[PDB]
Amino acid sequence: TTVLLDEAVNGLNIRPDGIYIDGTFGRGGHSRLILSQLGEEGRLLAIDRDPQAIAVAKTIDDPRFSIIHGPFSALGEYVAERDLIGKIDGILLDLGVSSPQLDDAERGFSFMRDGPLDMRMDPTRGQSAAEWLQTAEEADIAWVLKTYGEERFAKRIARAIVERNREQPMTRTKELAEVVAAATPVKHPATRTFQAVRIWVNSELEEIEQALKSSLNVLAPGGRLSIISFHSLEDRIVKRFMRENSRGRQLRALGKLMPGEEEVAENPRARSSVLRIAERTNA
Amino acid sequence: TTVLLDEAVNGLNIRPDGIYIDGTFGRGGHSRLILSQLGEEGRLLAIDRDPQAIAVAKTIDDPRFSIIHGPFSALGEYVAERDLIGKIDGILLDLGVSSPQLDDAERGFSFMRDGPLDMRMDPTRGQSAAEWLQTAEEADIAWVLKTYGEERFAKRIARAIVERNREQPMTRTKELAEVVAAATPVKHPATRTFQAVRIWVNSELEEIEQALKSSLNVLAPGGRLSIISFHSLEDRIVKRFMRENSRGRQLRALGKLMPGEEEVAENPRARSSVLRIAERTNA
Numbered sequence: 001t002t003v004l005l006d007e008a009v010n011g012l013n014i015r016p017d018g019i020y021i022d023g024t025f026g027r028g029g030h031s032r033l034i035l036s037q038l039g040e041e042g043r044l045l046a047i048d049r050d051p052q053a054i055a056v057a058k059t060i061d062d063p064r065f066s067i068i069h070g071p072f073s074a075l076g077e078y079v080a081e082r083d084l085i086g087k088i089d090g091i092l093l094d095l096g097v098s099s100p101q102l103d104d105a106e107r108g109f110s111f112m113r114d115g116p117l118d119m120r121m122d123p124t125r126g127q128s129a130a131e132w133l134q135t136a137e138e139a140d141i142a143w144v145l146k147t148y149g150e151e152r153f154a155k156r157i158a159r160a161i162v163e164r165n166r167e168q169p170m171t172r173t174k175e176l177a178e179v180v181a182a183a184t185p186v187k188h189p190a191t192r193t194f195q196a197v198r199i200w201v202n203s204e205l206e207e208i209e210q211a212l213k214s215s216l217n218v219l220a221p222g223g224r225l226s227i228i229s230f231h232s233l234e235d236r237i238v239k240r241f242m243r244e245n246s247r248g249r250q251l252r253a254l255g256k257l258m259p260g261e262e263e264v265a266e267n268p269r270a271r272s273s274v275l276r277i278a279e280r281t282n283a
Numbered sequence: 284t285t286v287l288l289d290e291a292v293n294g295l296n297i298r299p300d301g302i303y304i305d306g307t308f309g310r311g312g313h314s315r316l317i318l319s320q321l322g323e324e325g326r327l328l329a330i331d332r333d334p335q336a337i338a339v340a341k342t343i344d345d346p347r348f349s350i351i352h353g354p355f356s357a358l359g360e361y362v363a364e365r366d367l368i369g370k371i372d373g374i375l376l377d378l379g380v381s382s383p384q385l386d387d388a389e390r391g392f393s394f395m396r397d398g399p400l401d402m403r404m405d406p407t408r409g410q411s412a413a414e415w416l417q418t419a420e421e422a423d424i425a426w427v428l429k430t431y432g433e434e435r436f437a438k439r440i441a442r443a444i445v446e447r448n449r450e451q452p453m454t455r456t457k458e459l460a461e462v463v464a465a466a467t468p469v470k471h472p473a474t475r476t477f478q479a480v481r482i483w484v485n486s487e488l489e490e491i492e493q494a495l496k497s498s499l500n501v502l503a504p505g506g507r508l509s510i511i512s513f514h515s516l517e518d519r520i521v522k523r524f525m526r527e528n529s530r531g532r533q534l535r536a537l538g539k540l541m542p543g544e545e546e547v548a549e550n551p552r553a554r555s556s557v558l559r560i561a562e563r564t565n566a
């Protein structure tokens with residue numbers, strides 16, 4: 001069994017007639033897993049901001065299942081639209097990018113394979129990486145790199161980026177990667193930068209914050225939160241939130257699980273993953 | 284699934300040909316569960332200081348299984364006796380009393396049903412509760428009550444106990460319970476006292492400390508620690524130990540799980556249980 005799949009689903013404490021949210025449908029792994037544990041009175045409501053994820057979800061032929069296209073920050077609204085306030089028995093969030101977003105160079109997440117410098121989980125709307133970098137001030141880019149990338153060279157990288165875009169506007173991931181490599185002495189030099197930019201383009205951290213906030217208001221008594229963070233910056237947020245809300249009383253923190261050596265050798269990208277689980281009290 | 288059984292066993296990350304220790308055999312629940320996941324090359328070594336537990340283990344007819352009668356603090360020695368140093372793939376400890384110890388009034392753990400004031404997990408040796416209380420100084424008893432019981436009234440309770448034993452030596456659990464109730468104003472008054480005395484008679488906290496210490500030396504690379512604490516005083520120890528030894532590098536802490544509302548309503552005594560999991564690194 002794995003932390004990432006088996007433990008995360010366990011965390012939801014599924015009952016057959018319960019009502020669950022998969023806030024990060026992706027390719028339906030968790031969703032299918034949850035559905036297989038639901039009875040005929042069970043209900044699964046799924047969310048994803050990525051159209052391709054919606055395209056997968058669309059094919060699921062189950063009257064108990066539905067999908068919403070939008071950010072999981074609007075979780076509270078979705079639940080209100082359906083008069084489900086206080087009737088959610090579990091919310092699962094499997095945070096970060098999907099494998100298709102990573103593997104399809106055209107989605108523009110990769111500095112390894114060339115593609116449009118995009119980085120949007122939802123390319124239907126909002127500002128792309130290229131546009132953001134094309135308009136942003138040096139100080140802005142620097143702050144993004146330091147805060148979301150933990151990039152020591154944020155200032156010089158931001159400088160080099162601004163200069164480049166002043167002279168020859170960047171449009172492709174490989175251009176960005178090459179500018180970052182050049183700007184830095186000498187892992188790959190552009191990794192943290194790409195993470196920082198991605199996190200900015202997608203508001204990933206604030207998204208998590210807002211979803212966690214709304215979760216308290218939508219959960220039934222005994223309702224579960226089962227949240228997988230991909231890396232430290234997300235996890236910091238999940239931990240802070242569970243800590244603040246369980247000390248005293250609206251939540252009871254039920255703990256935290258990380259993948260062992262075997263699971264990480266089996267799956268490399270699980271390296272920094274952290275599952276956290278909590279439960280809505282009666283307060 | 285439960286934290287107490289399913290999650291704890293998951294924590295061991297069992298491979299079919301691995302070598303595991305169940306340090307708290309009890310009635311063989313975990314042991315049977317582990318065995319069912321072992322192949323023909325697998326090995327389970329079990330420990331318990333309680334003869335009745337040995338009497339259960341004895342009936343298990345499996346060449347892969349063996350039982351040792353002694354404190355789990357001697358874990359390191361047992362493993363050395365068998366030339367298994369560095370070859371243990373997992374150690375499970377399910378801490379505290381067994382249900383039979385609780386339910387059999389004659390074992391003298393209960394202030395509800397009368398029995399000999401004993402409280403020994405291993406009645407074959409060591410000093411009983413009655414003997415300890417019969418010889419101990421007021422200040423000693425007081426310290427035990429405060430530290431292991433978190434009993435506010437430790438001083439007056441210790442005083443009353445000393446006086447009682449000076450006049451009419453206590454020999455039965457109900458005598459102790461009545462003395463404690465009388466000594467205190469007015470839950471049940473004797474609960475914390477009984478816990479404190481039990482913990483002293485059995486050295487439960489130091490036992491845990493020593494076993495954790497030896498575990499580092501016996502574990503193979505990737506070897507697991509899966510430890511269930513029954514209450515806060517044990518858990519404090521497990522947490523401290525995993526924290527100290529994973530910051531920097533001999534252990535990697537893999538997290539912590541607590542039972543949710545449902546599991547605690549299903550099982551009352553799981554109320555304060557905490558599962559912690561770790562893994563031996565290569566250091």
Ligand SMILES: C[S@@+](CC[C@H](N)C(=O)[O-])C[C@H]1O[C@@H](n2cnc3c(N)ncnc32)[C@H](O)[C@@H]1O
Pocket residue numbers: 023024025026027028029030031047048049050053070071072073094095096097098099121204207208
């Ligand atoms: C790590 S994948 C989850 C994969 C899924 N658990 C599975 O088994 O296939 C994360 C998914 O959540 C989506 N996502 C990430 N953040 C989101 C957000 N803030 N709002 C809506 N969807 C989001 C991504 O588009 C991606 O498809």
Ligand SMILES: C[S@@+](CC[C@H](N)C(=O)[O-])C[C@H]1O[C@@H](n2cnc3c(N)ncnc32)[C@H](O)[C@@H]1O
Pocket residue numbers: 306307308309310311312313314330331332333336353354355356377378379380381382404487490491
């Ligand atoms: C909570 S019961 C474990 C029950 C077991 N997990 C099962 O499934 O049946 C704890 C057992 O561990 C034993 N035990 C507790 N502390 C011990 C110690 N320090 N050394 C050896 N055995 C101990 C007790 O005698 C008791 O039988």
Ligand SMILES: Nc1ccn([C@@H]2O[C@H](CO)[C@@H](O)[C@H]2O)c(=O)n1
Pocket residue numbers: 127135136137140141
């Ligand atoms: N609608 C929007 C979207 C993005 N921004 C960008 O936010 C950054 C603030 O550090 C700056 O980089 C700024 O360009 C904005 O100002 N308005």
Ligand SMILES: Nc1ccn([C@@H]2O[C@H](CO)[C@@H](O)[C@H]2O)c(=O)n1
Pocket residue numbers: 410418419420423424
């Ligand atoms: N072999 C032993 C066993 C127990 N004790 C008891 O340990 C307590 C120290 O606070 C005191 O209560 C003391 O009686 C001891 O001194 N020697």
